[PDB]
Write a protein that binds this ligand. Structure first.
Ligand SMILES: Nc1ncnc2c1ncn2[C@@H]1O[C@H](COP(=O)(O)O)[C@@H](O)[C@H]1O
Ligand SMILES: Nc1ncnc2c1ncn2[C@@H]1O[C@H](COP(=O)(O)O)[C@@H](O)[C@H]1O
Ligand SMILES: O=CNCC(=O)N[C@@H]1O[C@H](COP(=O)(O)O)[C@@H](O)[C@H]1O
Ligand SMILES: O=CNCC(=O)N[C@@H]1O[C@H](COP(=O)(O)O)[C@@H](O)[C@H]1O
Lengths: 334, 334
């Protein structure tokens, strides 16, 4: 087909349905007014709860339908990495250090093989993120779940005065992208429906099977970002998840002028199957898993720090074209 | 369908499948050794995380297949109460005061009317529990979810020295039960599969339709328990969820000698349809939604405090004899 909506995930409809839940949530903030745990507003990558000298950051994230690929090939060995990565990467975007995670595992059956595989990736992700897995919930629910749905909730800590929300972003700031490991965990419904029936899961593309491209575990950005924020002045941090580059608009009203990396790997296969390029930058990470915004004079030091850990790119600059994201080398405006 | 396992939920097989996940989680504890967020052990109602002067308690709970009844009859405005109740009631069982919650909503479709109803119950539960809903996650996943699955994660706070785990439970202690509002959110898979085909959700039993029996929202115990633990010495706290009375074995290895309330309402219908009483006490709450263990000299004041909130019962005593839960007035030993 063409779009994420036609694949079954209508982001516009989802936002419409969610307005009532978000309004209700905001009404509950007053229940902790002036007390420990008093929250900030909803809409950012994590909630910030006032504990006096510090904020606790709290976020919740699932893997999505990536688990349907894992099931077909009997490899849940890295789905736990995906779940941990999505949660801890979101914590970083308020400037918090990730501490602990609980997982929610909703399954059609208590399959011992699936669970042993899930456990392997949970450890690898936890070790790379520096977090303890401290508890969880397992729900065997075959009438409600057609596979093995893995989600979780993570908490982190950020000192008062060191929160990074994006309000410090100014025009002229440099925009830097850290490469993704691949598709990560966003847009799998479109990728699965577009490619699997046409090509088959065993289709071989640049020496890897389609399932390998679809299952590649999400990259964890904790070490480079925690190093970065303790060395250079950071104005904004954005984990590229659902919404793609639109996630930058959660940080600032200022505009962005970007040059994005070449379209490669699975993203090229998807593009060559008719998804419009503007939709692609709103759905897939397109090679950039994480974006940082720093003062222009810190650009080279930031790149030196990030490049120790992962391939990183100077993407562009913040502008006064309020509310616009110009992908200059593709002629796209979001 | 005369046991929970025959209805599709085999707790033995779930525990077996979870072994590698629990083992891996414990191997991650060392990642926070001596740092902020260092955890206690897994196994209890909540995780305890060391923040210096206090512990942060964290738990995650879903509603279960109760949501399939809500969808069948079109009544979603109380499952938000169930979700909040499950989470905050578990936080109470380490002695913590609930502070904040995030919700995970995995849905077949973004239906605006469903979301509007869910939002009503979310507010009602949050106000009664005294918590803010500070964020969440919404996943539209029709290939994976056959309904509207609602879960959440809650955090609470407990001062060092005031944690209530059950280790202070001693033989001779008094065991007090607080009535449930009904079936709560445990065992719905058995109740759905056993009752709905034969009777239909419109069947009237003892003055209420079957859907009313199955959808009655889970009771919230925050106000009575917080008053209790600030008034008398409390040795153990147990929210009666999956496993029924077996949850007491998580607090202590000492035995229990109990008299349980008469079988009424939905529990009587289930029993009359062939589920034996011994299975029923390990699946359903059987009229008791929360159990407290206090030294005998606190028993009269504890009953007075609890009875001002909900119907409460002296159930029995902790025994020097180990491991056994004797329900004396039904001739059942668990
Ligand atoms: N079901 C939900 N309940 C409460 N808040 C939500 C829910 N889904 C998303 N949010 C919030 O909406 C914002 C955008 O979420 P997302 O689209 O997942 O990045 C974040 O602040 C979330 O915490
Ligand atoms: N999927 C999971 N991951 C980690 N811990 C879990 C999981 N499921 C259950 N637990 C833990 O096992 C204990 C019993 O949980 P429950 O059977 O839900 O009462 C609690 O301490 C939970 O935190
Ligand atoms: O305890 C916390 N949340 C509730 C919970 O864990 N529910 C889980 O969902 C399955 C079905 O429950 P049912 O639909 O039969 O009631 C079952 O595995 C329960 O353990
Ligand atoms: O961001 C946190 N977790 C990821 C996430 O939000 N996943 C959600 O699941 C749906 C499909 O995802 P897909 O299977 O197409 O990737 C979609 O509604 C996403 O928002």
């Amino acid at each position: 087909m063409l779009t994420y909506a036609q694949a079954g995930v209508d982001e516009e409809k989802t936002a419409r349905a969610l307005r009532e839940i978000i309004r209700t949530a905001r009404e509950t903030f007053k229940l902790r007014k002036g007390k420990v745990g008093e929250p900030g507003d909803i809409g950012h990558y994590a909630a910030l709860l006032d504990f006096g000298n510090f904020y606790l950051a709290m976020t919740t994230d699932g893997v999505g339908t990536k688990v349907l690929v894992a099931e077909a090939v009997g490899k849940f060995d890295t789905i736990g990495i995906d779940m941990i990565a999505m949660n801890v990467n979101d914590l970083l975007c308020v400037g918090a250090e990730p501490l602990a995670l609980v997982d929610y595992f909703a399954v059609k059956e208590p399959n011992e093989e699936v669970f042993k595989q899930v456990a392997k990736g949970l450890y690898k992700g936890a070790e790379e993120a520096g977090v303890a897995i401290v508890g969880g919930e397992t729900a065997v629910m075959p009438d409600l779940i057609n596979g093995y749905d893995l989600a979780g909730t993570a908490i982190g800590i950020v000192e008062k005065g060191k929160v990074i929300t994006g309000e410090r972003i100014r025009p002229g700031d440099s925009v830097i992208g850290i490469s993704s490991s691949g598709i990560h965990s966003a847009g799998l419904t479109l990728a699965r429906k577009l490619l699997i029936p046409k090509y088959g899961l065993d289709y071989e593309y640049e020496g890897r099977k389609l399932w390998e491209w679809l299952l590649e575990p999400t990259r964890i950005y904790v070490r480079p970002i925690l190093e970065l924020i303790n060395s250079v002045e950071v104005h904004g941090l954005a984990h590229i998840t659902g919404g793609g580059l639109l996630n930058l608009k959660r940080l600032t009203n200022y505009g962005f002028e970007l040059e994005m990396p070449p379209i490669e790997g699975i993203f090229k296969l998807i593009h060559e199957n008719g998804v419009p390029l503007d939709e692609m930058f709103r759905v897939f990470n397109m090679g950039v898993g994480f974006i940082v915004v720093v003062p222009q004079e810190e650009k080279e030091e930031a790149l030196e720090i990030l490049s120790r850990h992962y391939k990183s790119y100077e993407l562009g600059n913040v502008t006064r074209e309020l509310g616009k994201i110009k992908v200059k080398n593709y002629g796209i405006t979001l």
